């Protein structure tokens, strides 16, 4: 049995931690909604 609990407002925060790269990848999406890498 599932239930929801509020966790916060949806707002942009100035001076949030900036991280993560921006990879450009070739991908395939199957009928089950699963992504895979194409080579």
């Amino acid at each position: 049995d599932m239930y929801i609990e509020r966790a916060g407002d949806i707002t942009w925060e100035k001076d949030a931690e900036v991280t993560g790269n921006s990879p450009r990848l070739d991908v395939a999406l199957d009928e089950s909604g699963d992504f895979s890498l194409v080579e």
Binding site: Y3, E5, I10, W12, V18, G33
Partner: protein, 156 residues
Amino acid sequence: GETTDGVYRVMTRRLLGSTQVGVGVMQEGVFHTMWHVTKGAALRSGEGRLDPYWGDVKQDLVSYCGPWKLDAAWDGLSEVQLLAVPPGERAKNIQTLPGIFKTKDGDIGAVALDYPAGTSGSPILDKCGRVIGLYGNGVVIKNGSYVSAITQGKRE
């Protein structure tokens, strides 16, 4: 039930203790999450009930109480923020410049950020605070790290 707009944790008591299986967005009276989080099961909100209204396994999305409301899109140039809601941890905004998933059907934004599986359904926002998609459906690249699509539905 709590109808207030905002980000919510999706919990289950079926397994050991109370486990967080995902996250979702409440907006305009509709709850938005990823299909792999709830599989479309009914949701409890206090004394109230949330029933699925629309869902699609291929897009990996589901909406409750009404049709999908989120229609903002990544502009393809600007940085965004993942409003990550990890299990047992406080909501935290993380800024990043999305990459790209290139498919035979067009290109989709992607966020290279690694969080526990129970963070799936956390919203990705633009500078105006608009939800441009949900985090949690992606791939594991050549070194073991996770890259998520910025998954957005369609507002009918």
